[PDB]
Write a protein that binds this ligand. Sequence first.
Ligand code: PGV
Ligand SMILES: OC[C@H]1O[C@H](O[C@H]2[C@H](O)[C@@H](O)[C@@H](O[C@H]3[C@H](O)[C@@H](O)[C@@H](O[C@H]4[C@H](O)[C@@H](O)[C@@H](O)O[C@@H]4CO)O[C@@H]3CO)O[C@@H]2CO)[C@H](O)[C@@H](O)[C@@H]1O
Lengths: 370, 368, 483, 282, 370
Amino acid sequence: ASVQLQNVTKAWGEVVVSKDINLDIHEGEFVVFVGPSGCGKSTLLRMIAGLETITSGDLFIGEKRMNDTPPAERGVGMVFQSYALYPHLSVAENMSFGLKLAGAKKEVINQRVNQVAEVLQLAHLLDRKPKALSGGQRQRVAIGRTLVAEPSVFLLDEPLSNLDAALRVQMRIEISRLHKRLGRTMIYVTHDQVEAMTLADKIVVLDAGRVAQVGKPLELYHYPADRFVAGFIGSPKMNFLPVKVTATAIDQVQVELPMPNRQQVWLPVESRDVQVGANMSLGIRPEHLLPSDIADVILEGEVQVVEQLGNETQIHIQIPSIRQNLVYRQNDVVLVEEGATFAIGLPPERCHLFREDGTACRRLHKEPGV
Amino acid sequence: ASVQLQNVTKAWGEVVVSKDINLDIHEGEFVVFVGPSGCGKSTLLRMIAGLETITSGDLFIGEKRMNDTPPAERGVGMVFQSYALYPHLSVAENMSFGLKLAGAKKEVINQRVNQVAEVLQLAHLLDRKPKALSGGQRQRVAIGRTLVAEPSVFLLDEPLSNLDAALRVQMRIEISRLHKRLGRTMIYVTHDQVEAMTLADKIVVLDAGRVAQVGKPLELYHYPADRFVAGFIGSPKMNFLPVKVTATAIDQVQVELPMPNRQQVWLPVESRDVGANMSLGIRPEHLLPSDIADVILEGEVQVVEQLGNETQIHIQIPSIRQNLVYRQNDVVLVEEGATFAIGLPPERCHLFREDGTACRRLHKEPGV
Amino acid sequence: SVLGLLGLLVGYLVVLMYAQGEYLFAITTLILSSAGLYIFANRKAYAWRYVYPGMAGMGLFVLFPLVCTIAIAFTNYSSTNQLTFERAQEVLLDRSWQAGKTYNFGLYPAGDEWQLALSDGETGKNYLSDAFKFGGEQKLQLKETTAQPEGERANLRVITQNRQALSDITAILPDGNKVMMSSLRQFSGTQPLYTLDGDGTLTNNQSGVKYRPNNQIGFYQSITADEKLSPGYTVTTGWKNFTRVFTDEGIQKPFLAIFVWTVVFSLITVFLTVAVGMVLACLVQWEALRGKAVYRVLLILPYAVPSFISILIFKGLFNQSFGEINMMLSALFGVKPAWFSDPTTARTMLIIVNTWLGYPYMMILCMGLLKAIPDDLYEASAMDGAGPFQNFFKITLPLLIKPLTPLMIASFAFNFNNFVLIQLLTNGGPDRLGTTTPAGYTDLLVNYTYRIAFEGGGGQDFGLAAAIATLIFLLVGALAIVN
Amino acid sequence: AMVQPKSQKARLFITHLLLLLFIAAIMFPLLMVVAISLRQGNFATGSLIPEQISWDHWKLALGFSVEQADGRITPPPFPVLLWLWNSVKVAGISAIGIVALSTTCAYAFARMRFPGKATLLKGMLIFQMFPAVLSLVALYALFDRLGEYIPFIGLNTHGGVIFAYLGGIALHVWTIKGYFETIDSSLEEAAALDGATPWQAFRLVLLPLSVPILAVVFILSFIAAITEVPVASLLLRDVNSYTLAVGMQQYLNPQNYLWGDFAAAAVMSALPITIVFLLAQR
Amino acid sequence: KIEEGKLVIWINGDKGYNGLAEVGKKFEKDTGIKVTVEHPDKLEEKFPQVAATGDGPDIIFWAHDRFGGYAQSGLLAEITPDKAFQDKLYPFTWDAVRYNGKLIAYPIAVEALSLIYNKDLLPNPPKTWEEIPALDKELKAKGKSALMFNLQEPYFTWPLIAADGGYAFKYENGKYDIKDVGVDNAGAKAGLTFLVDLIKNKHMNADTDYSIAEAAFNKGETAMTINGPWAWSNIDTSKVNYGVTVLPTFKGQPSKPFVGVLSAGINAASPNKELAKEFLENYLLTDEGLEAVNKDKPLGAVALKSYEEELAKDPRIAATMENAQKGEIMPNIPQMSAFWYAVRTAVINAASGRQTVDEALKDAQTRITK
Ligand SMILES: CCCCCC/C=C\CCCCCCCCCC(=O)O[C@H](COC(=O)CCCCCCCCCCCCCCC)COP(=O)(O)OC[C@@H](O)CO
Ligand SMILES: OC[C@H]1O[C@H](O[C@H]2[C@H](O)[C@@H](O)[C@@H](O[C@H]3[C@H](O)[C@@H](O)[C@@H](O[C@H]4[C@H](O)[C@@H](O)[C@@H](O)O[C@@H]4CO)O[C@@H]3CO)O[C@@H]2CO)[C@H](O)[C@@H](O)[C@@H]1O
């Protein structure tokens, strides 16, 4: 239960999707692969599972190479995106099929299935068939299958994907309690950043086959390695303002906004490998923006959209300077009419800066929980 | 355009899946049907659409009766959950299908197709086929079809259900800006309470084929009618603590907590109609720090979700099989298992009866 | 475990192919059976284990008769010239001529040991054997006698029960000739018709004429030191049957004529069977229609009736002057279409009949295949305001044809060689006038080639038809690969 | 239950009639045979509807002799129920054999990789386009020489006829292949992770999900074998070995045209496939 | 491969096969050997093909015309009847079954076509073909028809053709000159052109088979018909008051039908030649055996002299023999097969109207000689 990759590579014909990637996943670590649709989350998971070949590179699980080893003999169990429930078999048989075939032990099955069905609450549906079960129930059957199998490593391929928002939120808690109870390694594919931040001890952001960044939830959030990881993590997306670089210092970097009021501001950020007169993206999360009265760097424009979430208010502002509405976020309700003028404060301490290639300038402001 | 229902009912011979329910959807009003799966959201939309028959009652679209009227002549369009794209046709042929048949117009099609293709960015995908397109692209082609039709009412059966979360988040902004541009009536089915809150001018919550409550998102949020509506709407689920009633003044109602120390607290709430096992509703966001408020709720920290923008903390309160969830902006340094306390403001607490119906809060919440 | 036991059979039965001649069926028996043990033993060629037993049948009962019948094209295999050399000379050696005369025989028991008795009617004198025992070929030297045998005469049943042992007894008179059992009451001097010496030369014993095997025509024949012994034997004839196809004018004219009918028949059949089948398939699972299950089975009932009886009942119903179709057809109308005499009308009958047989197969196809279309396309079409005819031609049809294409080009190939229909209904249709070989107007290529080989009159040349079957097959192979 | 436009009955009512006219037209041929089987006298031509019912033709079909008032006990000319059984044996066993071979073969094509699979399947189809009617001589020769070594599958045996039909499986392999390629991969992948061998996946996962298409294939193979004439009559010489296909043509000698008897046997020969359709209501 | 121990017999369905089966029971009662009488369709067609490969029946029944071809192909075993048996049958019947001075089949009975008329409809049956058109109109307006018989088979239509001059093979004092054929000549055309004119004037139908004609006569719907002895059995059953008389004359000359002689051959491949001999000699060709067959379906004038003199007292058989003497014996040679097929084609094409009588017979003429 300690999977690890070294220069792993996949290619369909001459098309090389993923250049040599490395991962060091420790014992009992909740790892989460994240990215858009078709960025190589599932291919990785399936390459780990043995369902897909490795074109080049070493895959170890428990310090032993697994490339040529078939999926069955990898000490690994998968929860498929479609659940992969055998329609003809019952729920109990769906969960036990693996250990039913090869060493059929009636009493062993009965015990393992019922004990797993106890913790997942599938006890009263063991004699049912996959068609009868609701999606939420159907999902926990696919989970049970791996729990009954008791693999060293767990693989989950977008497990909460086809579930109701409310039920998707509830299952996250179940998976977090399920993980730290069993305490075994879990590799977890998903597109939702929300699911990564809460479940994962380590996250792997995948940009079209390339590994964008590997690290802890709060490390990725506070210190993205590039514009991609910055834009990917965040309930509402980060605001990216086109800014020209004007000056530089050892402890900070100065940049010029794209507005007619060409205001300038020093950011506490790695100045190493940056040039003056360069065009860059100012990163700033909707949550970190302050009210106008507080900060000195004001940003003012017409409000287009005002989403009242109850617990907070999300305001989209048309700044007549950048053609990309600035998203503001604030707790409690904020009575703001749509079409009305609204100003917001930009705090320099909470500002990212990404180069032409997209690489983030390493922030210098220390943040909590890192 | 001004769709409205009067005691509309659905059944399959005997068993009534949807009770006699009323809706009054005004002109140009964005309406969202919400609820879990199989609770009769799509059935309602399809009954409005004409894809399903109305077992009893009366439906009116533009102030004329439509029960017997077929779908095509209802002045309505639908975006289907599976997009309903004709795979043997191209995007352009898909979008122009509606008016290709019935009034064959060459120049009128090209105009409306390219007009809608412009705003959805499907101008380069016109020649392509649904199999070639991505989930996001196919989803836009589906809406593009209804936009080319230009119906007075828009029906959408979970249009963003299968897209990525990031793309789903993005497509609500596109939907809102599209709706306020056209300004025409939209009915929009979704399981995601977040989509309703962000999109809806009027939310209709459904509980097993029954309208629980109707009103503005912020109205349903601050003032739930019953335990389900309260439990449904809210990012993390509302905390429910069983409590015993002690006092009962005309102005407000009091309750007794189940904790080892039997604490008491008054709650500004409708006292019309003691010792009743009521549920104390309170959202994680409305909970305070323990140093501020006088009512404290200490417990053991079970799970800590570090979301970056906030920290959602689950607290094992003694004498209750329910982890009290807490929520606070920015990151908060707390360990899993450490002792932690929080404040409970009486001005922000809901109250529910044994049956499930909610006592109306008398606290003047801003927004309503 | 079982590789040895099966491995022994691959050798036990395989060596018996080498013995008793049969080189023709000796190689394939080893090759195919060795591959089975080669595949099923080791687990490197695992995929072939699933394919082997299926392709074994393809090899044995499809490919072999094809390869075999192509080799028949390079020879004069016919009705007259059918057997091999060893069977043909064995047929000639088996027959006999009556050299002596008939003697009425009897069988009389003397304890366990039986006793025979013959009687010559020309002389009147009788003869009788000693106490012999039944079993094996034995020569009973008979003895003349005036007296009677002891023991009662054996009845027919008893002598019938010992027919095998009594036929092997080759008795002979004191100074007469040899004699064997001819019936259950008579012995007669049967002797071989021919005798085969060292070299291949049979010689008649009755007439006194020698015959030598002429291996050009494939018969035994005599030379003037002519008669032709016509059991006949097969012999190779290189590129003669094939060249006759290109040479013969009478064969060549209808050969392409029927090819037009064959292709058109199979095209029209496929179109109508699909059209009727698909239309019915849509209607049967149409929401609003009531008696679906009742309509569904009734439309399938034709398929529950075997083709060959449906054809033969139609053969009766479609009779021209009589038959029940024209009995009605000259009641509501005043006409009696010549369903058998007229080529076109007979072709119309074939198609009308064939469609009746063919549509259920297509319906059952389109029914299940139509459920591959998701419902929400028609619901989307209903929002747009499409009618039934619009739903059919704009959604259903163009969406059904794509998966249905392979099945209906496979349906084309079936009808292209639909032999049973033509033979049983029309037997080729009206005869094409002025032809060398038998040809009709509703004949397919397969029928024409069958008509050549088998049908009485107009030749029975299996070698010629075998050449045409090869000549057609390779053209369809050249057509199919390019397509 | 969608709300329907323009009256609906305009097309719903008119459809019922069109179907009613169609079923009438297509059933009509079969209505004749039933009537002919109840028609007194054995002539090829007679009244449309029987003047009086006659159980003679059915009696001798079922195997009973019939004493007429005139010409004594005329015995049953043919063992029809024997033939019926022989038709069901040869078809049913052949159909099970064709399913077993084609399904196993199609499993290899659908999933397993081995070079020259496209050319093999394409070849199989191409080779099958040669008609078995133009083999006979080679087939008779094949089963004549194959008979003396293996008696139970030679000439004049039901085994021989079955083994003959086992060859043609190109369409079955392709159709079952296409079905397999339709099926969700996660089941077989899950099964692989569960430790199931390729066979265990074939048997325990793939096959039970493929019951419908196998049921179809069986019926098509069964119907094919029931109606097969050219080969059956080439192999089956004895009357007690005949199937319907062979034996049913013995009725219609022009000079002894047993038309009414044939009709009784003909109605009875539709029984096996009907039972199959009825038993295939699953 | 023919089975030893039993006797398989083949005989045409129009003959009394059930009667012959009773002679089989009588054979089995004494010998213990089962006799199986089958009656396959196209029996005479099938035997050539099965016999050459070793298959076939032990005994084969047909008219003597197809036996020369069978014997020449090497299919028939030469029969070996002693002097005492040959003198039991009429000499000319043996001559019908003699091929190259060798007896190749047991002759059973003499077949011959006769005019079978209905007494209640037609008390005075035509002596001429020419008076049938007149007689047809008389019966047509009455609701009946004059004459319905088989036009599909030459056997039935040849008597009219050969009457005025037509012939198969000219008998060169001792032998049939096979290159000399008389289907093309004016005598054959006359009779054929007459028959066509009967169809052209609606007196008959070109598509009228044995079963149609039989149905018409046996149900009292036609006054006359043309058929052999075998057919009387069904007419007796229908109880249509009938008479068998001489065939009507065409252009002065009388109808000259081809006289058949039902004959039993022994397959050369048969392993039961000794049992076949007994059955045919001592069981079939006796008074009792022939009566058993004749009682089922009349054989005509039998070859067995003893049973013939008993049966000759039948007025139908006297008429059958009258037509037989007026006609001529069928050649036994191989080329008779060629003769029959080509004439069937000629008659059908001419009667259907696809060809002229001249052209149809001209094509036939060439098919025989080639
Ligand atoms: C030679 C062709 C004729 C075949 C003879 C068949 C014998 C019966 C005669 C039928 C005559 C047509 C009468 C049809 C009357 C319409 C009745 C009706 O209105 O019923 C329609 C049924 O469809 C439907 O067959 C639509 C109706 C089909 C009409 C099309 C007929 C011509 C088709 C010719 C093309 C053949 C294919 C060519 C292949 C290359 C209603 O369809 P929908 O509401 O969209 O259903 C939706 C459901 O499927 C969803 O689950
Ligand atoms: O080719 C199509 C037809 O072929 C077959 O009929 C053929 C026969 O094989 C030939 O032998 C010949 O038939 C002759 C026959 O040789 C001759 O004996 C006589 O048949 C009489 C018979 O003597 C009498 O006993 C009784 O059975 O009536 C018979 C007539 O029906 O005359 C026959 C010719 O009429 O030629 C015919 C074709 O002319 C095959 O059996 C047919 O089914 C097939 O259509």
